Amino acid sequence: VKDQQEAEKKKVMSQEIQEQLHKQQEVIADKQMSVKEDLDKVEPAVIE
């Protein structure tokens, strides 16, 4: 039972990890915007 409870505290960490998947959505959204700004800007300097 105790082990299982420690595994279920680790499942509470997997719930924190699901918050961090929401943070992955924030991270992906802002990175998709920064990567778009870097596509709009950066490809000419690489060509140059």
Next chain:
Amino acid sequence: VKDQQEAEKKKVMSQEIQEQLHKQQEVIADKQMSVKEDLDKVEPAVIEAQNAVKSIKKQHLVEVRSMANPPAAVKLALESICLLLGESTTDWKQIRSIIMRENFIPTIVNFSAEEISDAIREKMKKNYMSNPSYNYEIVNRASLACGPMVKWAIAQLNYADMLKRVEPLRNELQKLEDDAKDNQQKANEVEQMI
């Protein structure tokens, strides 16, 4: 396993309950201080409150029919009627106010949180005027009826404004109590439901 986990969530509630035992220590400390302030203050008013019950019909009824009021009795008696709503300086309003058989009831009724600050401050000033009279004159002996209700009105004021120091403490005690009691009810529920 799942049940056990629910019982162990109820053990997390027993950890909250241990926080509420720390709240019981806060609640006990502030209550021991408020109960000490209430021991320092409240026992004379209970001694006084009992002394109206003792005071005899004959002692008051003879004096209510007197032709002229004696100067210690007037000074002490006028300011009691300034509690009792028909604020007045006249002997015949004292006679009419004190005649009613509904005056054997309200001797004990009057409460110390009903008193207004300017009424307290006026009587602190009338205490500065009448300091050698009051309970000292009651001991003298103006009458057997005077002494009791004399000390009666003489107090009440020493609760007042000193009860406003007990207004944050009692309101803090109520907030600590009502949050702690609902939480202690959750404790008795939680121990049963574990």
